[PDB]
Design a protein around this ligand. Structure first.
Ligand SMILES: COC(=O)c1ccc([C@@](C/C=C/c2ccccc2)(Cc2ccc(C(F)(F)P(=O)(O)O)cc2)n2nnc3ccccc32)cc1
Ligand SMILES: [Cl-]
Length: 289
């Protein structure tokens, strides 16, 4: 029982010794590496938002296009946690069709967005979804139609319901879009509570359920914020299923996740935040709630 005051004690111990950056750099250097040949092909240069962030060849999501099957997106599968996620970059002006094509083919039912489309001091992301219910979007290259159906705006996040339609089979699917709007580039969420609240919300939607395809998670590069979000989620799952919560080594989990996509969690503070959100979140889930 009193095993929760343990992990939070070593957390404060790490905080006391200011060892976060050390642990984080240790993780960057223990991180596995795999080839990204497809990602680096000249024809896929314009499909990559950033020169140095690429999906590994083994876990990259392949588009069912006959021509070019590339999309900077990676499938992260966590066995013990029993959860899969697709991490991708913020869609580019020329890859919005690819993005939705992937959402369709992969049968995902939810999209989690952790970055903002624009501002001034923030990385730009393409407006890959319709902002107005009356202005649906058609992606000619992927023969898909997208319509905004609902848009519940809250303080730290907006929940939108979209309708994605395969113009060929004429099938339509409800896609839930969870947009956390207060997580700056290379920063942390507004607070652990808002982050968790957002996470629990995405959870309760069933968007992460094994019933549907893997949820799609992205920020700008698809590694810092996306990695933090997924790491927190997986670790919470693990602390809930395991008899011994403190047996969950967030560091091992992150390294495990990095085998599927490079650079997950981009700052020492994000790592700290993941520990903090997981400990607090674990307390909540096991504390009556
Ligand atoms: C001035 O613009 C920026 O703020 C900026 C910061 C970092 C970067 C990264 C920096 C590259 C980092 C990297 C490279 C190799 C392995 C792992 C990480 C890409 C990147 C952007 C944002 C994030 C994030 F953390 F905000 P996310 O939450 O959206 O994921 C991550 C990465 N990047 N990718 N290729 C580069 C080539 C030269 C210099 C920097 C480069 C790009 C732009
Ligand atoms: Cl890194």
């Amino acid at each position: 029982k009193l095993e929760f005051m343990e992990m939070e004690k070593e957390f404060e111990q790490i905080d006391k010794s200011g060892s976060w950056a050390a642990i984080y750099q240790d993780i960057r250097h223990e991180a596995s590496d795999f080839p990204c040949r497809v990602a680096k092909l000249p024809k896929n240069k314009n499909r990559n938002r950033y020169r140095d962030v690429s999906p590994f060849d083994h876990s990259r999501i392949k588009l069912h296009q006959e021509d070019n099957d590339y999309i900077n997106a990676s499938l992260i599968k966590m066995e013990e946690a029993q959860r899969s996620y697709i991490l991708t970059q913020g869609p580019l002006p020329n890859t919005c069709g690819h993005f939705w094509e992937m959402v369709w083919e992969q049968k995902s039912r939810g999209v989690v967005m952790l970055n903002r489309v624009m501002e001034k001091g923030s990385l730009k992301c393409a407006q890959y979804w319709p902002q107005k219910e009356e202005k649906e979007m058609i992606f000619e290259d992927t023969n898909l139609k997208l319509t905004l159906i609902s848009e519940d705006i809250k303080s730290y996040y907006t929940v939108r319901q979209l309708e994605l339609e395969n113009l060929t089979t004429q099938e339509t699917r409800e896609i839930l879009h969870f947009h956390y709007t207060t997580w700056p580039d290379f920063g942390v969420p507004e607070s652990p509570a808002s982050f968790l609240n957002f996470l629990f919300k995405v959870r309760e939607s069933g968007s992460l359920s094994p019933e549907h395809g893997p949820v799609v998670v992205h920020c700008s590069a698809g590694i810092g914020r996306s990695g933090t979000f997924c790491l927190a989620d997986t670790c919470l799952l693990l602390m809930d299923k395991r008899k011994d919560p403190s047996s969950v080594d967030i560091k091992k989990v992150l390294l495990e996740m990095r085998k599927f996509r490079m650079g997950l969690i981009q700052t020492a503070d994000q790592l700290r935040f993941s520990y903090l959100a997981v400990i607090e979140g674990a307390k909540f889930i096991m504390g009556d709630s």
